[PDB]
Each structure stands twice: as C-alpha cells, then as structure tokens.
Design a protein around this ligand. Sequence first.
Ligand SMILES: [Fe+3]
Ligand SMILES: [Fe+3]
Ligand SMILES: [Fe+3]
Ligand SMILES: [Fe+3]
Ligand SMILES: [O]
Ligand SMILES: [O]
Lengths: 158, 158
Amino acid sequence: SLNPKFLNVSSLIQYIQSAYHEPLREEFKNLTPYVTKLSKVHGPNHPYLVELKETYDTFKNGMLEHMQKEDDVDFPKLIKYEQGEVVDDINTVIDDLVSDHIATGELLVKMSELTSSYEPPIEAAGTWRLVYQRLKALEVLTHEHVHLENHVLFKKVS
Amino acid sequence: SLNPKFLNVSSLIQYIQSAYHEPLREEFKNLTPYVTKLSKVHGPNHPYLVELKETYDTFKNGMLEHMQKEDDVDFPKLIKYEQGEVVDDINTVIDDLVSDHIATGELLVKMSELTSSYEPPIEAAGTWRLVYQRLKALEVLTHEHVHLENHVLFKKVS
Ligand SMILES: [Fe+3]
Ligand SMILES: [Fe+3]
Ligand SMILES: [Fe+3]
Ligand SMILES: [Fe+3]
Ligand SMILES: [O]
Ligand SMILES: [O]
C-alpha cells in the first residue's frame, strides 16, 4: 500500500484534487436535494433536522469556497514555493487554510451531534436513513482529506 | 494510504522514483562493499559465494542501467503519451521494460537459490548474516517495485 510521505508537493496536490476535491463537489451536488427534502418533510415534526439542513449548507458552502481557494490561488503557491520561487504569505496561506480546516471540523462535530452521531430514530425511513449514512461517509472522507493536507502536505512546505 | 487509481501517470512515476529508485541506488552503494568482502574472505572455501558476488553485481548493474533508462528516456515518454502527444513507440517501450523486469526477476531467483532462500549456515556470523538479511529485504522491495510498474503504471497507458 502506497505511503503518501514519498509524494512530493505537486503529486500530493494532484492526488488531493482527484481523490478528494472533485468527488466532494460531486457528492455535494448529489446529496443536497436529499438534505433539503428531509428538512422540508420531517423538519416540522423534528426541528433539529432544520438545524441540520442549515449546518449542512454552511458546511458545504464553506468547503466549496475553501477548495476553490486551494485550487485557484493557494495550491499553486505551494508548488511555486517547492520549486524555489520566492513566496511571501506562505505561512499566511498555511495559517488561513488551517483556520478553514478547524472551522470545517467543528461544523462536522455539530452535524454529528445534531444527528446523535448518525443514529436515526425508529420513526425514520428511506430518505432519512440515506441522508444519515451519506453524511457519516462525507465526514469520514473529509477527516481523511484534511488530515492529508494538515499533516503531510503542509508539513512538506513549512 | 494512497489509492493508486487517483494518481495520474506523472505522479505515480514520481512516487516510484522516491519510494523505489532512489532508495535502491542508495542501498546498492551501501551493500556492495559487504558482498565484496563476503566473497573475498569466505569465497575461496565457499565458491557459491563468488558466484553470488558475480550474480549480485550483474543484477545490480542491470538494475542501475534499467532505472536510468526509465528516468531519463522511457518514463517521460509514458507521461507524454498520457498527455496526448504522439509517442508511436509506446508498446515497444513497455515491452522492453517488461523484458528487463523478467530478466531481473530471474537473477533474483538465482540469488535466492544460491543462498537457500537467504538463510545463513550456522557457521556464518557477522558480515555473512548481514548480507543475507539485506539481500532478502532487497528482493522483497524489488518485487513490490516491479509489481507496481507492471500492473499499475503500465496499465494506465496500455
Ligand atoms: Fe482540500
Ligand atoms: Fe483544504
Ligand atoms: Fe523502476
Ligand atoms: Fe522498471
Ligand atoms: O480541505
Ligand atoms: O524497475
């Protein structure tokens, strides 16, 4: 099995973008209608599901803006720094990306708290259980993703 | 641990170069003196150690020339073929690389036969036991190396 420590900065970035950023965008497109439906249908009975929709939307919009910043501005800066060019704001860039990750992590903590980890009541059927499983999988994937960035990619440039 | 289907050709090549090629060159530099000393001290009364020295040398020079060919000429062609440019000898390239790996593999089975699968005789000590340990691990390392190229890297482009 392949050890990410041997990748250099630009391969680690290509890997992140293929394994994490693009599947994340696609899962967001696919999953948001279901979160919205769950809120619309059972939110009146259960107000924590409306809070879940809004926390999920905030989580999603933050992640999309964060991945666009990484793809368009900041990952290219890490690559330039690895090649020997002068990059000021390199620790500014790293610190803002770490701040973004910490915020995303606390939103995941909140979503999981809202759903009692991701345990659906016996009242739940179909769309409800789908949303819970997908949100749990999105949390696992996001944890792996930001751990790769924080403890491998950023350590190679700091 | 990485999933190779998200590494493109360029990144997987960089991976192989950091994880196998450069460590293998370092290990050849460090291990050769010990092989030469084992054959010089114990070779006279144990001629299979002299045969082992000559087989190891052949295996090692073939590996070094083969990795040079991949790094300087053939891996860049795999990357160009991934990137759409015309590389009308790609299959020739892959066939010669596969044939090289076969030849190396057979040199390894020979080295293993000479050493009874790298288990030292009782009367061996020190340098003799060191050489068998290091050769055993270098065979393990080389099989992984060759399997990654043959069955992951070369299948991305053929
Ligand atoms: Fe990211
Ligand atoms: Fe990130
Ligand atoms: Fe190789
Ligand atoms: Fe090779
Ligand atoms: O991220
Ligand atoms: O190789």
